[PDB]
Amino acid sequence: HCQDCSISQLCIPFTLNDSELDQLDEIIERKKPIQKGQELFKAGDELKCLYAIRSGTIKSYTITEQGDEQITAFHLAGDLVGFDAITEAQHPSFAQALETSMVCEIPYEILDDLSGKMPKLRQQIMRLMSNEIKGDQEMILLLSKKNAEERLAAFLYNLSTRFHQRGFSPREFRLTMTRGDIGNYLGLTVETISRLLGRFQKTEMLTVKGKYITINDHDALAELAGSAKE
């Protein structure tokens, strides 16, 4: 159940000859679905497999000394979860599903075994890590230079894009995560998150119905997202 995949283009078997493909799936792709709110691993757990998101939504977080969750990323289908566990065979982070999700469990060593063995695989694994790094860098700029109007716009631009790539309307999409969770990730207040979407709707940039977002003006939206100003 893995040669079949409409996101393999952005997932892990990207640019594999059909021999590489029929081989990989043999060692992954089969985990009775993860339920909304259940975890894939706890911080401190040993690294065994990495997780490719087949369907659904997953957040990554930690807990502060004083006990608050802080979200470090949301994951969409095609995303790989577990990279930060490679350095030390161990998960520093939590991961939890936000909705019923399908997840492909890829055994790290076995994948590592087959990567030295596979140039196009090895290379693909690389840029995937490269890209998480790139993303995290963008997050850092978001939290230093962008104000709340911008942070949210950026966040919403990002999702919209990513859904586009995973073959969806760039126009319309639901927030699977809660407003609480969005505010967490973005250093904003559920109070503020809401207020902003108001303004966004007020300008006809955005239409908002429950958890469903509609973008009526990508150009406006990108201007706010790409600002980084005060």
Place this chain on the structure above:
Amino acid sequence: HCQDCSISQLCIPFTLNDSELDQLDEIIERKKPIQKGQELFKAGDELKCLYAIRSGTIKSYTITEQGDEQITAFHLAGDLVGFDAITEAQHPSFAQALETSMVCEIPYEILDDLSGKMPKLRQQIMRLMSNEIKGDQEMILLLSKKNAEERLAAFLYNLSTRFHQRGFSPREFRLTMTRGDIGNYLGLTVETISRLLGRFQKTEMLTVKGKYITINDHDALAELAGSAKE
């Protein structure tokens, strides 16, 4: 000039048989020293080599739409600069030396060529990326959950540690970067940066003379760094 290196333990030829070692250096390790303020690459440049810091200090940054520098990391000896350029053969970031620095130019393709060829190398390259990701995650928590007292303490804890590993006093070390740059990275004010070091000195935790920092109480310091509170 590369089998000789008192930081190879944390640099790139970590866990290489002496055949792997004598081989690698042949393709790197020789760039007439980078001067304080000169750049290694401009955002948008093509990926050719990655850069291992042999000596000195290097910052990574971008420029906002409205034209402000934002620093995404400081690099010490042993650190590899360029990972975020792998996804798309291209540097999204700038890199600039903060003091006269020695830099080992490692050709990416050639290094990639020899990595599929080398299990222990490939694996080492992995965790290095894994670790940048991990670091960036910590930065994200710093910018969301930590206040200024904590941000600085954290930052200073981090440097102190990293100098320790690179074989130095954990006790005492200079800030090579400017207070401006520290404040940039940390979302703080040169006004605030200074005030804090005052308090830090006031409590005898820290002794501060010009650019030189002395930690008299690592335990205090780590408590503030590891807080993430308000």
